[PDB]
Design an enzyme around this catalytic site. Sequence first.
Site, PDB file in Angstrom:
ATOM      1  CB  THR A   1      65.454 -22.369 -30.100  1.00  0.00           C
ATOM      2  OG1 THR A   1      65.090 -22.944 -28.842  1.00  0.00           O
ATOM      3  CG2 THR A   1      64.567 -22.961 -31.194  1.00  0.00           C
TER       4      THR A   1
ATOM      5  CG  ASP B   1      29.808   1.950 -44.677  1.00  0.00           C
ATOM      6  OD1 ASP B   1      29.550   3.089 -44.254  1.00  0.00           O
ATOM      7  OD2 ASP B   1      29.674   1.606 -45.880  1.00  0.00           O
TER       8      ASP B   1
ATOM      9  CG  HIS C   1      32.996   6.007 -42.392  1.00  0.00           C
ATOM     10  ND1 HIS C   1      31.725   5.609 -41.993  1.00  0.00           N
ATOM     11  CD2 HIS C   1      33.375   5.269 -43.454  1.00  0.00           C
ATOM     12  CE1 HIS C   1      31.372   4.666 -42.840  1.00  0.00           C
ATOM     13  NE2 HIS C   1      32.330   4.436 -43.744  1.00  0.00           N
TER      14      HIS C   1
ATOM     15  CG  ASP D   1      64.172 -22.017 -22.345  1.00  0.00           C
ATOM     16  OD1 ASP D   1      62.994 -22.132 -21.929  1.00  0.00           O
ATOM     17  OD2 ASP D   1      65.180 -22.231 -21.638  1.00  0.00           O
TER      18      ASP D   1
ATOM     19  CG  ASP E   1      68.584 -18.028 -21.336  1.00  0.00           C
ATOM     20  OD1 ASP E   1      68.774 -18.485 -22.480  1.00  0.00           O
ATOM     21  OD2 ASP E   1      67.950 -18.645 -20.444  1.00  0.00           O
TER      22      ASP E   1
ATOM     23  CE1 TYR F   1      25.233   4.861 -50.376  1.00  0.00           C
ATOM     24  CE2 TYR F   1      26.739   3.565 -51.705  1.00  0.00           C
ATOM     25  CZ  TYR F   1      26.493   4.344 -50.592  1.00  0.00           C
ATOM     26  OH  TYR F   1      27.493   4.622 -49.703  1.00  0.00           O
TER      27      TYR F   1
HETATM   28  O1  LIG Z   1      26.557   5.492 -47.387  1.00  0.00           O
HETATM   29  C1  LIG Z   1      26.900   4.682 -46.544  1.00  0.00           C
HETATM   30  N1  LIG Z   1      28.224   4.475 -46.273  1.00  0.00           N
HETATM   31  C2  LIG Z   1      29.288   5.193 -46.915  1.00  0.00           C
HETATM   32  C3  LIG Z   1      29.820   6.256 -45.983  1.00  0.00           C
HETATM   33  C4  LIG Z   1      31.159   6.816 -46.449  1.00  0.00           C
HETATM   34  C5  LIG Z   1      31.116   7.380 -47.833  1.00  0.00           C
HETATM   35  C6  LIG Z   1      30.268   8.450 -48.143  1.00  0.00           C
HETATM   36  C7  LIG Z   1      30.264   9.007 -49.422  1.00  0.00           C
HETATM   37  C8  LIG Z   1      31.102   8.495 -50.411  1.00  0.00           C
HETATM   38  C9  LIG Z   1      31.942   7.419 -50.108  1.00  0.00           C
HETATM   39  C10 LIG Z   1      31.960   6.871 -48.824  1.00  0.00           C
HETATM   40  C11 LIG Z   1      31.739   7.831 -45.494  1.00  0.00           C
HETATM   41  C12 LIG Z   1      33.011   8.339 -45.743  1.00  0.00           C
HETATM   42  C13 LIG Z   1      33.605   9.271 -44.886  1.00  0.00           C
HETATM   43  C14 LIG Z   1      32.917   9.733 -43.765  1.00  0.00           C
HETATM   44  C15 LIG Z   1      31.637   9.245 -43.511  1.00  0.00           C
HETATM   45  C16 LIG Z   1      31.059   8.308 -44.367  1.00  0.00           C
HETATM   46  N2  LIG Z   1      25.992   3.945 -45.814  1.00  0.00           N
HETATM   47  C17 LIG Z   1      24.593   3.933 -46.203  1.00  0.00           C
HETATM   48  C18 LIG Z   1      23.902   3.084 -45.150  1.00  0.00           C
HETATM   49  C19 LIG Z   1      25.000   2.260 -44.469  1.00  0.00           C
HETATM   50  C20 LIG Z   1      26.313   2.739 -45.058  1.00  0.00           C
END
Ligand SMILES: O=C(NCCC(c1ccccc1)c1ccccc1)n1cccc1
Lengths: 546, 546
Positions: A122, A334, A523, A10, A184, A465
């Site tokens: 307090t 991402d 990123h 307070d 205070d 991927y």
């Molecule tokens: O590849 C994808 N993200 C990784 C990007 C990352 C990365 C790229 C390559 C390797 C690891 C991590 C990046 C890192 C730094 C700057 C830009 C991007 N995306 C595919 C579709 C949605 C996401």
Amino acid sequence: TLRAAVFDLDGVLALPAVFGVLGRTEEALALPRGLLNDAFQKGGPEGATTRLMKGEITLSQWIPLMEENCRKCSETAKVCLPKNFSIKEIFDKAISARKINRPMLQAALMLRKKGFTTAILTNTWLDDRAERDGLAQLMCELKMHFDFLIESCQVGMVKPEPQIYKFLLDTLKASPSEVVFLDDIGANLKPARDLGMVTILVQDTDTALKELEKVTGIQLLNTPAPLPTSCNPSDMSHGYVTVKPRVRLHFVELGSGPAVCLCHGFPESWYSWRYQIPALAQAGYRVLAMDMKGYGESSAPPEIEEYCMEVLCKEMVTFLDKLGLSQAVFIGHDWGGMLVWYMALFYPERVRAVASLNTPFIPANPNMSPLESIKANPVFDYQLYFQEPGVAEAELEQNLSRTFKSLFRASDESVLSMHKVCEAGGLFVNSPEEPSLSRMVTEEEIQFYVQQFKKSGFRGPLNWYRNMERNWKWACKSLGRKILIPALMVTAEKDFVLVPQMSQHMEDWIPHLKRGHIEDCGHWTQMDKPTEVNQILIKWLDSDAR
Amino acid sequence: TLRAAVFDLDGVLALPAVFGVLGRTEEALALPRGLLNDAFQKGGPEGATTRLMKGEITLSQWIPLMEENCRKCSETAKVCLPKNFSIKEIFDKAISARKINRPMLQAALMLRKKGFTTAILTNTWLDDRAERDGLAQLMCELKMHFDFLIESCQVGMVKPEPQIYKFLLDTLKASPSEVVFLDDIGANLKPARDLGMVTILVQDTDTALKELEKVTGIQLLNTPAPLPTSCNPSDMSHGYVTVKPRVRLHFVELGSGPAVCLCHGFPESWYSWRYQIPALAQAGYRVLAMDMKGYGESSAPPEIEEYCMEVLCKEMVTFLDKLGLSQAVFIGHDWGGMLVWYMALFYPERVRAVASLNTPFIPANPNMSPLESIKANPVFDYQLYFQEPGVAEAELEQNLSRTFKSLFRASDESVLSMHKVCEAGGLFVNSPEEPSLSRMVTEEEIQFYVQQFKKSGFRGPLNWYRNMERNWKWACKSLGRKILIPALMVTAEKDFVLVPQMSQHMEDWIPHLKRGHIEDCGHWTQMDKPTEVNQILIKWLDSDAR
Ligand SMILES: O=C(NCCC(c1ccccc1)c1ccccc1)n1cccc1
Ligand SMILES: O=C(NCCC(c1ccccc1)c1ccccc1)n1cccc1
């Protein structure tokens, strides 16, 4: 020599003080000067207020005792209390008006960062009013920034009794000359000063902070704006849900209110949202930060087809079902952002609102496979390198510290080129073996990701991927649909892979789409510009997802 | 021979059907008979509704297409649509009015219990309306009772296309003559019947259930009221919070809404609340069922002083702080109920509402130690037997199956006497080695507790009894306080230890106390009378804790 700083709640960490509101009530109600403050202190150590501060009675039991003190005081002053005089209305309004004194809290946070033990000492009460949640929320926000919280009503002692100062020194394990005490009320400074403690009489915050600067030798006033509050993983609630016989999802949970699901990208963790989790919980949201499938404490099955978007989205729906959540706000970054757009297209009834950081909504082209579209952009060459199982895993797992130090860098610090990765034979072939630490991350934060990826490696994360064709054939079923639920797209100026211009035609598919743009942000959005991300998300959540 | 039962959602598991509401709208709006149902079916397999049921477009994209079909239909009928005609208002009201057909769901639950595979095969849409949560909640409640949920908009096929029936048989791994198919639309029965499936045309539920009884040979109509839905531990979200370096608390979580903390007694588990957890989540609450300190997956430190009420209550406050909850409703039973009264006396700002099952609030007597008060009641003699460390642990751990079979019994099945336990030399000295299974519990439920107590034993649980003096001295600090927050006391008629008459003077301390009383209910309240407990708690939560 000084190693501890004690603050009163307070009038010091929270403003305005209750005594300030008692004085304003007498001026507003045309009552004699000091009348309410006399009723408050009536009886001294044997009065109702001392019994309340010691925890003998609760706030609701004290209210009619204070009302009786007010009448006894007005009878000697030969005055009449107004028609609708109520101690409850006066105290409810006074408690509710009290907010955190941000400069005083920034100074305490800065002293704690510099090695000081910080405490709140307090004189407070057991609040049993219907409105006690307001006080509980204030106490929760404050207590996380201090090593100790000593409340008179819990220890049965009050300031200025000398026993509470002895109790304080024993709790801190310090001698009086190592302690700074801020209050205070001058009467509460007197016993701390008799013991030899450094005392600061807080009248206004700025002068109090200049005295604290002079005595600690630490700059507190005029310092830069600090980063948001971060997460300590060992202080988090850890949740584990089995979505299917061999797949278990791990999440971290904080807050109450509408559920908000945070979906990280590659190669990340729930920890990537460390600056957002406390801010979003404090904004009034129940935050669930996921370890996506293949990462950290979540299951990482070896099979490629376990990471196609269809399986991934179905498991997130099952995740909601097992937690008993009909809806959640989905916020992705991402690969996580890629997933939250498909959650909105395939399960809109389960998605309250959808937000993506960096990742645009790109519809599938039925006339072209995604592998031929990947070749048409030289910046997406690292995605072709990630196709063959074993190859990228060997490079990324070889030295974990190097992998995260090379990746987690601000736009100006980037030591990698995503083009011609295939011709060079790797992501790190012309990169240093020992990269410098980025200004964005600390060594301790880098080692958290290292420890997480030591468990299941990069196979699961890289399998996201390896479903280009399966994801494309599944996305082609949503080409006649539109996203008509609340949606936010946040672009990052310096993301050279997920460039802001990749999002420009999103309005054709999401007509009422809201936008956010962060300048000088690469990123790694959440950790690059945490304050900016938090303000954009909290504003959109408060307006479109509540 | 019959081993699978397939139900449609609309008009079968949920009433009323959308087609019933289209017919009522034409009667209410004085429109030609069948006009809205013609607009709905307009175009057949190439119309807007088939595209909607196949998942090509969402509900919001279909709404203006249906509006256009309504005008095209009214122009050929030579009629005018009213001034404020809106497909959205009509469909919102129709979707919102639809509730679960409880008798049809009880029949499906009964068939599944008897070994049948159950499925929902529905023609449904991707709902993206602002009101889509109502539908999401209905789907969540239903899908937990069925083995499969096949939605047309997810598989791209619709009834009556023969491909959806082939898809259904492949999903069920069954031949058509082993399947019963229930549908309110005769056209959808035709292809199931061509394959050789048993079909039931649902016009009214009772006649449909009599046909289902006759063909399955299982009684579905006129059967007794079933027990509430129970928990499958492996389907629960498991949470783990570290409240202090060596103490971690485990909880199970389900639902969204105000937080409700369930606190079990001795010698129990979070599993003791298995009938309450789904009902309370369905009532609109976020349920956190704890494994109290010393039990199951929660830490069990060996030291006695770790289980005094003061340490226990402080750790529950820290538990709230780490989860980011300013308040929770605290519901306790037995030792858990003892703890929730002290949470209300010492931390009222963190307790939204307080409820106790069986355990009364008994204030500490400052003129008498609790050990001398224990001797004055012969039914509390087992508490003196629990004082010496090692003695009761050896008897209770010797045969875990026998311990839980002897304890978990209804009032008429009790095989133990709590008086003269000390003179006899044990709780089970004149009890059978192999007690019969109580009608209250199953063998699988008994083995869950056996597996839980195999981990840390009875030391931690028994240490709750070994702080009589510490708990008494701490409770004596609250003798001047009253409980002025929402409070519920539930008494159990046949609890011979925590007798209902032990609660009669509670109004002196909790003046606005609400009461509940369960007749023919022993000590194990939650599992003895689960439906009665659920209704008393849900009614009090909805009125006093929201
Ligand atoms: O590849 C994808 N993200 C990784 C990007 C990352 C990365 C790229 C390559 C390797 C690891 C991590 C990046 C890192 C730094 C700057 C830009 C991007 N995306 C595919 C579709 C949605 C996401
Ligand atoms: O002893 C307490 N509860 C255990 C009762 C239980 C039991 C007694 C003795 C051994 C194990 C379990 C019981 C079982 C059946 C019927 C009535 C009671 N309480 C002490 C203060 C608050 C709870």
